[PDB]
Amino acid sequence: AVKKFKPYTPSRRFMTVADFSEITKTEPEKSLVKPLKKTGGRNNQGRITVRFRGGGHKRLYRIIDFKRWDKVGIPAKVAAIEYDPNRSARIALLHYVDGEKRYIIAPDGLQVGQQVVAGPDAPIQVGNALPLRFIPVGTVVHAVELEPKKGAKLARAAGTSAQIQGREGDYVILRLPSGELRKVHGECYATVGAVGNADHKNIVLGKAGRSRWLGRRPHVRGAAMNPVDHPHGGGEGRAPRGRPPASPWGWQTKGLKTRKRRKPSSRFIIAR
Amino acid sequence: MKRTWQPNRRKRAKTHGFRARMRTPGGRKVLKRRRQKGRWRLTPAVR
RNA sequence: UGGGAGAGGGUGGUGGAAUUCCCGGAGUAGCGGUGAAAUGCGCAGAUACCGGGAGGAACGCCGAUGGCGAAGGCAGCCACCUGGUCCACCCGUGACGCUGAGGCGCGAAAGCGUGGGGAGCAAACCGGAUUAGAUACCCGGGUAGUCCACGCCCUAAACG
RNA sequence: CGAUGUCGGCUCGUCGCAUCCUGGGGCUGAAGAAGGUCCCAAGGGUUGGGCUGUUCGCCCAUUAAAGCGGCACGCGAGCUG
RNA sequence: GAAUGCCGGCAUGAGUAACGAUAAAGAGGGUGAGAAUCCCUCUCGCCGUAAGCCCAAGGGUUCCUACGCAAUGGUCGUCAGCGUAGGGUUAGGCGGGACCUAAGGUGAAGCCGAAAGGCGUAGCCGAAGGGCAGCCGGUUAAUAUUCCGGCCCUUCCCGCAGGUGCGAUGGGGGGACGCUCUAGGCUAGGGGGACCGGAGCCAUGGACGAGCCCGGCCAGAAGCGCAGGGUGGGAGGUAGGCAAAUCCGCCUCCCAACAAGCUCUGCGUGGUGGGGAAGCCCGUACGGGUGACAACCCCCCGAAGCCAGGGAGCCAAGAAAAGCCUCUAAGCACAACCUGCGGGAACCCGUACCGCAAACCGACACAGGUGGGCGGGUGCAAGAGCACUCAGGCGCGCGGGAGAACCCUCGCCAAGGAACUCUGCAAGUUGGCCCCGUAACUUCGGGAGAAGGGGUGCUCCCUGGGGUGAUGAGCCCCGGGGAGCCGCAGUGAACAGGCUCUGGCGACUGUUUACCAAAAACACAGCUCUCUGCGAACUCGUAAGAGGAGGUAUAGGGAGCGACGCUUGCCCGGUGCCGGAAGGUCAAGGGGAGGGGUGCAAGCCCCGAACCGAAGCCCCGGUGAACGGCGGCCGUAACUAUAACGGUCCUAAGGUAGCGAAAUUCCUUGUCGGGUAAGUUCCGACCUGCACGAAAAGCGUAACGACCGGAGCGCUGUCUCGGCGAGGGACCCGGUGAAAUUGAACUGGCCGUGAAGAUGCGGCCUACCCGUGGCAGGACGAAAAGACCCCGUGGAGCUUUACUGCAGCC
RNA sequence: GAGCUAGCCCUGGCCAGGGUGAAGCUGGGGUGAGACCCAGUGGAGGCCCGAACCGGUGGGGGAUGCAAACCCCUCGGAUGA
RNA sequence: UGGUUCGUGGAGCCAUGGGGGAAUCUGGGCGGACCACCGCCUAAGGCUAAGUACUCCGGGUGACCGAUAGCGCACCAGUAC
Ligand SMILES: [Mg+2]
Ligand SMILES: [Mg+2]
Ligand SMILES: [Mg+2]
Ligand SMILES: [Mg+2]
Ligand SMILES: [Mg+2]
Ligand SMILES: [Mg+2]
Ligand SMILES: [Mg+2]
Ligand SMILES: [Mg+2]
Ligand SMILES: [Mg+2]
Ligand SMILES: [Mg+2]
Ligand SMILES: [Mg+2]
Ligand SMILES: [Mg+2]
Ligand SMILES: [Mg+2]
Ligand SMILES: [Mg+2]
Ligand SMILES: [Mg+2]
Ligand SMILES: [Mg+2]
Ligand SMILES: [Mg+2]
Ligand SMILES: [Mg+2]
Ligand SMILES: [Mg+2]
Ligand SMILES: [Mg+2]
Ligand SMILES: [Mg+2]
Ligand SMILES: [Mg+2]
Ligand SMILES: [Mg+2]
Ligand SMILES: [Mg+2]
Ligand SMILES: [Mg+2]
Ligand SMILES: [Mg+2]
Ligand SMILES: [Mg+2]
Ligand SMILES: [Mg+2]
Ligand SMILES: [Mg+2]
Ligand SMILES: [Mg+2]
Ligand SMILES: [Mg+2]
Ligand SMILES: [Mg+2]
Ligand SMILES: [Mg+2]
Ligand SMILES: [Mg+2]
Ligand SMILES: [Mg+2]
Ligand SMILES: [Mg+2]
Ligand SMILES: [Mg+2]
Ligand SMILES: [Mg+2]
Ligand SMILES: [Mg+2]
Ligand SMILES: [Mg+2]
Ligand SMILES: [Mg+2]
Ligand SMILES: [Mg+2]
Ligand SMILES: [Mg+2]
Ligand SMILES: [Mg+2]
Ligand SMILES: [Mg+2]
Ligand SMILES: [Mg+2]
Ligand SMILES: [Mg+2]
Ligand SMILES: [Mg+2]
Ligand SMILES: [Mg+2]
Ligand SMILES: [Mg+2]
Ligand SMILES: [Mg+2]
Ligand SMILES: [Mg+2]
Ligand SMILES: [Mg+2]
Ligand SMILES: [Mg+2]
Ligand SMILES: [Mg+2]
Ligand SMILES: [Mg+2]
Ligand SMILES: [Mg+2]
Ligand SMILES: [Mg+2]
Ligand SMILES: [Mg+2]
Ligand SMILES: [Mg+2]
Ligand SMILES: [Mg+2]
Ligand SMILES: [Mg+2]
Ligand SMILES: [Mg+2]
Ligand SMILES: [Mg+2]
Ligand SMILES: [Mg+2]
Ligand SMILES: [Mg+2]
Ligand SMILES: [Mg+2]
Ligand SMILES: [Mg+2]
Ligand SMILES: [Mg+2]
Ligand SMILES: [Mg+2]
Ligand SMILES: [Mg+2]
Ligand SMILES: [Mg+2]
Ligand SMILES: [Mg+2]
Ligand SMILES: [Mg+2]
Ligand SMILES: [Mg+2]
Ligand SMILES: [Mg+2]
Ligand SMILES: [Mg+2]
Ligand SMILES: [Mg+2]
Ligand SMILES: [Mg+2]
Ligand SMILES: [Mg+2]
Ligand SMILES: [Mg+2]
Ligand SMILES: [Mg+2]
Ligand SMILES: [Mg+2]
Ligand SMILES: [Mg+2]
Ligand SMILES: [Mg+2]
Ligand SMILES: [Mg+2]
Ligand SMILES: [Mg+2]
Ligand SMILES: [Mg+2]
Ligand SMILES: [Mg+2]
Ligand SMILES: [Mg+2]
Ligand SMILES: [Mg+2]
Ligand SMILES: [Mg+2]
Ligand SMILES: [Mg+2]
Ligand SMILES: [Mg+2]
Ligand SMILES: [Mg+2]
Ligand SMILES: [Mg+2]
Ligand SMILES: [Mg+2]
Ligand SMILES: [Mg+2]
Ligand SMILES: [Mg+2]
Ligand SMILES: [Mg+2]
Ligand SMILES: [Mg+2]
Ligand SMILES: [Mg+2]
Ligand SMILES: [Mg+2]
Ligand SMILES: [Mg+2]
Ligand SMILES: [Mg+2]
Ligand SMILES: [Mg+2]
Ligand SMILES: [Mg+2]
Ligand SMILES: [Mg+2]
Ligand SMILES: [Mg+2]
Ligand SMILES: [Mg+2]
Ligand SMILES: [Mg+2]
Ligand SMILES: [Mg+2]
Ligand SMILES: [Mg+2]
Ligand SMILES: [Mg+2]
Ligand SMILES: [Mg+2]
Ligand SMILES: [Mg+2]
Ligand SMILES: [Mg+2]
Ligand SMILES: [Mg+2]
Ligand SMILES: [Mg+2]
Ligand SMILES: [Mg+2]
Ligand SMILES: [Mg+2]
Ligand SMILES: [Mg+2]
Ligand SMILES: [Mg+2]
Ligand SMILES: [Mg+2]
Ligand SMILES: [Mg+2]
Ligand SMILES: [Mg+2]
Ligand SMILES: [Mg+2]
Ligand SMILES: [Mg+2]
Ligand SMILES: [Mg+2]
Ligand SMILES: [Mg+2]
Ligand SMILES: [Mg+2]
Ligand SMILES: [Mg+2]
Ligand SMILES: [Mg+2]
Ligand SMILES: [Mg+2]
Ligand SMILES: [Mg+2]
Ligand SMILES: [Mg+2]
Ligand SMILES: [Mg+2]
Ligand SMILES: [Mg+2]
Ligand SMILES: [Mg+2]
Ligand SMILES: [Mg+2]
Ligand SMILES: [Mg+2]
Ligand SMILES: [Mg+2]
Ligand SMILES: [Mg+2]
Ligand SMILES: [Mg+2]
Ligand SMILES: [Mg+2]
Ligand SMILES: [Mg+2]
Ligand SMILES: [Mg+2]
Ligand SMILES: [Mg+2]
Ligand SMILES: [Mg+2]
Ligand SMILES: [Mg+2]
Ligand SMILES: [Mg+2]
Ligand SMILES: [Mg+2]
Ligand SMILES: [Mg+2]
Ligand SMILES: [Mg+2]
Ligand SMILES: [Mg+2]
Ligand SMILES: [Mg+2]
Ligand SMILES: [Mg+2]
Ligand SMILES: [Mg+2]
Ligand SMILES: [Mg+2]
Ligand SMILES: [Mg+2]
Ligand SMILES: [Mg+2]
Ligand SMILES: [Mg+2]
Ligand SMILES: [Mg+2]
Ligand SMILES: [Mg+2]
Ligand SMILES: [Mg+2]
Ligand SMILES: [Mg+2]
Ligand SMILES: [Mg+2]
Ligand SMILES: [Mg+2]
Ligand SMILES: [Mg+2]
Ligand SMILES: [Mg+2]
Ligand SMILES: [Mg+2]
Ligand SMILES: [Mg+2]
Ligand SMILES: [Mg+2]
Ligand SMILES: [Mg+2]
Ligand SMILES: [Mg+2]
Ligand SMILES: [Mg+2]
Ligand SMILES: [Mg+2]
Ligand SMILES: [Mg+2]
Ligand SMILES: [Mg+2]
Ligand SMILES: [Mg+2]
Ligand SMILES: [Mg+2]
Ligand SMILES: [Mg+2]
Ligand SMILES: [Mg+2]
Ligand SMILES: [Mg+2]
Ligand SMILES: [Mg+2]
Ligand SMILES: [Mg+2]
Ligand SMILES: [Mg+2]
Ligand SMILES: [Mg+2]
Ligand SMILES: [Mg+2]
Ligand SMILES: [Mg+2]
Ligand SMILES: [Mg+2]
Ligand SMILES: [Mg+2]
Ligand SMILES: [Mg+2]
Ligand SMILES: [Mg+2]
Ligand SMILES: [Mg+2]
Ligand SMILES: [Mg+2]
Ligand SMILES: [Mg+2]
Ligand SMILES: [Mg+2]
Ligand SMILES: [Mg+2]
Ligand SMILES: [Mg+2]
Ligand SMILES: [Mg+2]
Ligand SMILES: [Mg+2]
Ligand SMILES: [Mg+2]
Ligand SMILES: [Mg+2]
Ligand SMILES: [Mg+2]
Ligand SMILES: [Mg+2]
Ligand SMILES: [Mg+2]
Ligand SMILES: [Mg+2]
Ligand SMILES: [Mg+2]
Ligand SMILES: [Mg+2]
């Protein structure tokens, strides 16, 4: 629903921000925040391991419930929908009838005021979490555990959704957001709805700096490098790739698969 | 212009000083060499 | 006021046949294709058969010189929302009417922008035949597109 | 090669003559005027511009003429670059 | 006797360059053995968002005083930041620790590693962050928020008095937070004043005057007042805050909707405490007395500071823990806690001095570098700008003369204006504010300060708005109209764009080669390809572990292109990558046909053929925004010319669109046209593209550009073509006094000669001895064991289908 | 050895004064309802002019220097990568 | 795989990281692949002086030096810098 800009500077010609229309509460719940360690790419050795990170806006981390079999049977009233900086989705503030407050991430089509509940016996209705063995086949669904009681791994980004295409025995068959078809165990919880903020991927950042506010630093091509630095480096003049196109560490980056071949997960994976 | 030696009594003691020699097995051999030399200051004098 | 018909339109949902692909079984020396052949597919087990699964598009019989709409145009079924129209009763208002330069809206198909989707067909493109030659007609592949949402384009043998 | 700084421009000259002009002369297919060619002759003079890093060259407008070469293709402990 | 040899010593250059900002000096008087340089007075100049105060870092005695001058001071020195000696730094309230946590470090539990060691939850350490109780003056030669004076506070510990279930390192609240823009009321700060208090002064033509000059404050408990911040109050129900809770959280009705009530700050007032100018008189270097019984009043401007956790908006969504409050748990409830009072107790370290600099970092009393706060006044529209100047601090630790060339930094110029030159390089024109007015083009924002104009000072009169005060005077902020005055000139000084047309590259702001390159290179939003289903892929690591990520296909990695507009054609034969349970080949291992060596034999020990044996390669397909590639020869059309057309060779295919003598064009200054008097550059065309061409992208593109090219207008010392003037050097004198270089030197020209470029050889010529200011032709001048070339079976960096290995992967 | 320098993490600070005037609000116009168009308010931006601050474009000086990167004139950014 | 003179060699012996895996005197290793004969030792637990190496320190001696030599230092030196 994505809010655009008159071209009164050169960067504001193309820059789009999101609407923030579903946001009801501008300031996060005090008992559910804890500080993000900004890391900068830098591991415990101090070395860069992911290049070109840092410089971001400071963030407080919002504790998300990715389990929701913690609190089976206890319904919750949706009290607020909020901005999480740490993820593409929005988040929903739940006041449970206990008075435990939790965040969950926000489906498409939540309203404030409404009631959600996890359950094998919850209604099949947006925001409720069931095992996958109890959701009817053909529903779209999100927040999907991959192995049971290990918490939600699958379909967490903004707009994303997985669909149940079958059962087979203990296991159910998911169309993942990649289009991968995968056997997931039936007792893995999953949370119905697709995820909201589906207009995330139409955001055009507009200028250089809005990359830097998110902690994405400048990315340097290997053709601008020198042959110690990169395979693509060097060449008096500009340079075609000269060789099959290649990472800084030597391996190819047009086509080369590196799914590990003897992985035990591949017996659970149908297509790709 | 801004030259190289910009002194700091925190940094001098925490880097070159005696308690940070004796963490490292290289740094204990520093004081061993300076004792065997006979130096009057095994560590840099900070105050 | 009381009724009637209709693919009139918008939204949500849903049913079956068939094409393609994938998986399993069985099964052989050929299948497609044409005027005829060839490209092509096939002993790495194709076509032809059965069973399961996924996906998209269009809805056979009803069905026609039929209906509906101002035009473009509209066809499985279900529900919601909604426009037009016709008949009867002759009840009310009481000339309130006709057309309409501009304006405003709608406007097949092709085309364009963002995202999705892509089974079949199919510009461009690639082969194989015809021919003196083929940038075509015929044949085998095949990308945009054809589909959806939103925004444009504003055309025609938009014809009675 | 335990270093002789390379092109072009500027500044500053100085030298040679196989002379562009000026001076003297022979022959002329030299009527006159203007020329051609050769001999003597360096004392002096030998312009300002457009283009190009240019030297050279091509044009513009003049001129009596718009000379060719040497001096480490003179001259960077003189300058530019 | 040589090694550009090592160490030391002393010479040459040479009384030469220089003496470290062109902010500036002159005189009188003292001390002294000795004064331009030390102290005092007068005159002059310089800084004054500092070149003036206060913090922090760093430095470590440099502070003050007394006595000195060998060395240090770029001269001198009686002076000093120097030598000797003595003195000086006082804290419950300032900073830090017996408080807390952040990144990080360490690290019992635990994980890993040949050893050394590497990780790691809780914990602990870790500070310009959070927490916490002191303001104003006075004394010293030198310390003070530290001592003294006044006023006011915080912790403990022990007592009594009155209240309450008290009670944890445990639960909860709070602490607690972004950027930008702001309202109200204050304070700091400043301006004015006829009012108040002052020593005094009428000068030189006038003035005894609401004259001139100086000053009209500071802190301050309780209690009021004015601003403002935080906050709902009961009742039940309760399974969540890992035990328990009356607390918190979540429901359900009742009264508020407000700050009404509670607290809590800020600011005024406040008992009382203190300060108190100019001028004059002095005896120090620095200070004192008087002026004073001082006055200590009123207006205006007003903050970026306070109320503070204020309000509004926005996306990029903005630390933790303790102090503090509350709630229970054991234990206790003769306790323990809270409020009031009294008595008592309150440790360790720093404190001097410099601190945009002569005391820090630069070997130096070095024109460089160094974080935070105050930083007055007037005018210029505003300002931390600029000019002058309060307080305050300086005249930069060599001077005196002279008035050449030459150099640096300035000023001016006849006539001409780019003729200079690689280039208007440099320098000049323009310059601030107000009002007219402003083109192509465009992404409708811009282009725009387009361009080009007019106004600009002062006096008098009339006149409209606000803010503070009562609607009023005054004080302040803004305007309008009319009439005049002066000068060459009115932003009268200083600070303050030259403009336009056109092309190339890159969309734009940005980034880089610290110390010769700021660009068309890098980056950039944006496009595509590819990988990656999560103990992800990728990366660091032997491992453990960690980043990715406390992310989950709208996410993460890798590669290329690089906003946007219109587009990205053909070749999959070779290389890469992807898909193929067939087939060829393929190692260990299985398998033993058969044979061998020894034994008197049972035996023991060897080879060893079929056949079964993975990945990989061969093979079959796919794949270009993967690596890459994208032709040649003949003939033909009613005049030549040309070839729409055809024939033919080869290829995997034979360059499509769009550009094109281009950042690409050798021939080349191609050829036409435009500009010019004249144009190897420029702009527009043709295509004969040596050798453009579609994501190492193609062709365009408004705006942007300290990028690169061409042209014109204005303007000028760039030039014709120079001239004059100013200052800092240069020159002379006094003081101090280097350097690279140097075989020794008694060191001329020509023509020859010589290892082929002679002061030194030969012949001739010329020439008394020695300096100073200058110029650079030579001494193959100095400096660097040439960096271009070659050599060395010299070395490093980089590449690959060179060789051979290794990590990694299968 | 990261007290220079490059990147990142934690915690603080700094950016005088002027211009332009996006969204959004309010009134009005408009329509069946709208889109939309006027004003007024508003105060956005890797916006503009320019000190501190960060740089280092062109020229000149310097060249055994004040300086082993300096000085003068000029110039770029200056609410943000 | 390492050690030994042993660099795969006819490669034994000794120690081993991986796989298989006995016996207790009629049992086992060895004498350089292997076999026979003849011989030599008794693994898979550990301790053990002296003879050997060095010179921070004390002493003796020198066809060793004599302040550019001898230690870096004869001297308040691992100091000043
Ligand atoms: Mg928290
Ligand atoms: Mg760590
Ligand atoms: Mg470490
Ligand atoms: Mg890049
Ligand atoms: Mg490069
Ligand atoms: Mg490197
Ligand atoms: Mg490489
Ligand atoms: Mg390359
Ligand atoms: Mg090239
Ligand atoms: Mg009737
Ligand atoms: Mg009538
Ligand atoms: Mg249409
Ligand atoms: Mg269509
Ligand atoms: Mg489309
Ligand atoms: Mg087809
Ligand atoms: Mg076809
Ligand atoms: Mg018709
Ligand atoms: Mg040479
Ligand atoms: Mg020499
Ligand atoms: Mg002659
Ligand atoms: Mg003559
Ligand atoms: Mg003659
Ligand atoms: Mg003649
Ligand atoms: Mg004649
Ligand atoms: Mg010209
Ligand atoms: Mg030129
Ligand atoms: Mg030449
Ligand atoms: Mg000549
Ligand atoms: Mg020559
Ligand atoms: Mg020459
Ligand atoms: Mg030259
Ligand atoms: Mg140059
Ligand atoms: Mg050059
Ligand atoms: Mg000799
Ligand atoms: Mg010698
Ligand atoms: Mg010497
Ligand atoms: Mg001398
Ligand atoms: Mg002299
Ligand atoms: Mg001399
Ligand atoms: Mg001299
Ligand atoms: Mg001198
Ligand atoms: Mg005397
Ligand atoms: Mg400090
Ligand atoms: Mg200190
Ligand atoms: Mg010092
Ligand atoms: Mg001292
Ligand atoms: Mg004295
Ligand atoms: Mg002295
Ligand atoms: Mg003495
Ligand atoms: Mg002296
Ligand atoms: Mg000195
Ligand atoms: Mg004396
Ligand atoms: Mg002193
Ligand atoms: Mg002293
Ligand atoms: Mg203690
Ligand atoms: Mg204690
Ligand atoms: Mg502590
Ligand atoms: Mg702690
Ligand atoms: Mg550790
Ligand atoms: Mg250990
Ligand atoms: Mg830790
Ligand atoms: Mg602190
Ligand atoms: Mg603090
Ligand atoms: Mg304190
Ligand atoms: Mg005081
Ligand atoms: Mg003092
Ligand atoms: Mg006191
Ligand atoms: Mg209690
Ligand atoms: Mg807490
Ligand atoms: Mg707590
Ligand atoms: Mg005041
Ligand atoms: Mg008076
Ligand atoms: Mg008088
Ligand atoms: Mg006053
Ligand atoms: Mg006051
Ligand atoms: Mg007061
Ligand atoms: Mg309540
Ligand atoms: Mg409980
Ligand atoms: Mg209120
Ligand atoms: Mg009070
Ligand atoms: Mg007084
Ligand atoms: Mg006085
Ligand atoms: Mg607030
Ligand atoms: Mg703690
Ligand atoms: Mg002190
Ligand atoms: Mg002090
Ligand atoms: Mg300062
Ligand atoms: Mg110094
Ligand atoms: Mg230095
Ligand atoms: Mg010093
Ligand atoms: Mg000095
Ligand atoms: Mg200095
Ligand atoms: Mg400076
Ligand atoms: Mg500074
Ligand atoms: Mg001020
Ligand atoms: Mg001022
Ligand atoms: Mg004035
Ligand atoms: Mg002012
Ligand atoms: Mg101004
Ligand atoms: Mg200020
Ligand atoms: Mg100033
Ligand atoms: Mg003064
Ligand atoms: Mg001086
Ligand atoms: Mg004059
Ligand atoms: Mg002139
Ligand atoms: Mg003139
Ligand atoms: Mg002119
Ligand atoms: Mg010229
Ligand atoms: Mg010329
Ligand atoms: Mg030019
Ligand atoms: Mg210029
Ligand atoms: Mg002017
Ligand atoms: Mg233009
Ligand atoms: Mg405009
Ligand atoms: Mg103007
Ligand atoms: Mg006047
Ligand atoms: Mg006021
Ligand atoms: Mg008023
Ligand atoms: Mg005038
Ligand atoms: Mg000016
Ligand atoms: Mg060009
Ligand atoms: Mg750029
Ligand atoms: Mg472009
Ligand atoms: Mg700009
Ligand atoms: Mg830029
Ligand atoms: Mg550089
Ligand atoms: Mg360098
Ligand atoms: Mg530069
Ligand atoms: Mg693009
Ligand atoms: Mg897109
Ligand atoms: Mg590794
Ligand atoms: Mg991990
Ligand atoms: Mg994590
Ligand atoms: Mg991706
Ligand atoms: Mg990516
Ligand atoms: Mg590129
Ligand atoms: Mg490009
Ligand atoms: Mg366009
Ligand atoms: Mg292509
Ligand atoms: Mg290919
Ligand atoms: Mg291929
Ligand atoms: Mg192929
Ligand atoms: Mg393969
Ligand atoms: Mg074998
Ligand atoms: Mg075998
Ligand atoms: Mg075998
Ligand atoms: Mg195989
Ligand atoms: Mg012909
Ligand atoms: Mg042909
Ligand atoms: Mg083509
Ligand atoms: Mg041309
Ligand atoms: Mg012409
Ligand atoms: Mg012409
Ligand atoms: Mg021409
Ligand atoms: Mg052209
Ligand atoms: Mg051409
Ligand atoms: Mg070319
Ligand atoms: Mg190209
Ligand atoms: Mg190319
Ligand atoms: Mg390409
Ligand atoms: Mg282009
Ligand atoms: Mg352009
Ligand atoms: Mg341009
Ligand atoms: Mg001149
Ligand atoms: Mg002169
Ligand atoms: Mg002068
Ligand atoms: Mg002298
Ligand atoms: Mg000679
Ligand atoms: Mg001679
Ligand atoms: Mg001789
Ligand atoms: Mg001389
Ligand atoms: Mg000379
Ligand atoms: Mg000279
Ligand atoms: Mg020379
Ligand atoms: Mg030389
Ligand atoms: Mg050499
Ligand atoms: Mg070099
Ligand atoms: Mg060789
Ligand atoms: Mg070699
Ligand atoms: Mg390996
Ligand atoms: Mg650093
Ligand atoms: Mg400002
Ligand atoms: Mg508006
Ligand atoms: Mg603004
Ligand atoms: Mg800006
Ligand atoms: Mg600026
Ligand atoms: Mg400041
Ligand atoms: Mg700096
Ligand atoms: Mg830089
Ligand atoms: Mg510069
Ligand atoms: Mg320079
Ligand atoms: Mg500037
Ligand atoms: Mg500018
Ligand atoms: Mg061996
Ligand atoms: Mg061996
Ligand atoms: Mg061998
Ligand atoms: Mg061996
Ligand atoms: Mg073993
Ligand atoms: Mg073993
Ligand atoms: Mg054996
Ligand atoms: Mg043996
Ligand atoms: Mg044996
Ligand atoms: Mg034997
Ligand atoms: Mg034996
Ligand atoms: Mg034994
Ligand atoms: Mg001894
Ligand atoms: Mg001797
Ligand atoms: Mg010695
Ligand atoms: Mg001696
Ligand atoms: Mg020695």
Residue numbers in the entry:
A (entry chain RD): 2 to 273
B (entry chain R7): 1 to 47
Paper lines:
We next asked how ASLPro interacts in the P site with a CCC-U codon, a slippery codon known to facilitate +1 frameshifts. In this X-ray structure solved to a resolution of 3.4 Å, we find two different conformations of the codon–anticodon interaction in the two molecules of the crystallographic asymmetric unit. In the first ribosome molecule, nucleotides G36 and G35 of ASLPro form Watson–Crick base-pairs with the first two nucleotides of the 0-frame mRNA codon. A mismatch C+3•C34 forms at the third base-pair position of the codon–anticodon interaction and contains a single hydrogen bond between the Watson–Crick face of C+3 (the N3 position) and C34 (the N4 position). The codon–anticodon interaction is in the 0 frame as indicated by the clear phosphate density of the next mRNA nucleotide, U+4. Strikingly, in the other ribosome molecule in the crystallographic asymmetric unit, the codon–anticodon interaction is in the +1 frame. The first two nucleotides of the anticodon (G36-G35) form Watson–Crick base-pairs with C+2-C+3 nucleotides of the mRNA codon, respectively. At the third position of the codon–anticodon interaction, a cis-Watson–Crick U+4•C34 pair forms that contains a single hydrogen bond between the Watson–Crick face of U+4 (the O4 position) and C34 (the N4 position). The absence of electron density for the next nucleotide in the mRNA confirms the +1 frame of the codon–anticodon interaction as this is the last nucleotide of the mRNA. Therefore, although the m1G37 modification is present in ASLPro, the shift in the +1 frame can still occur.
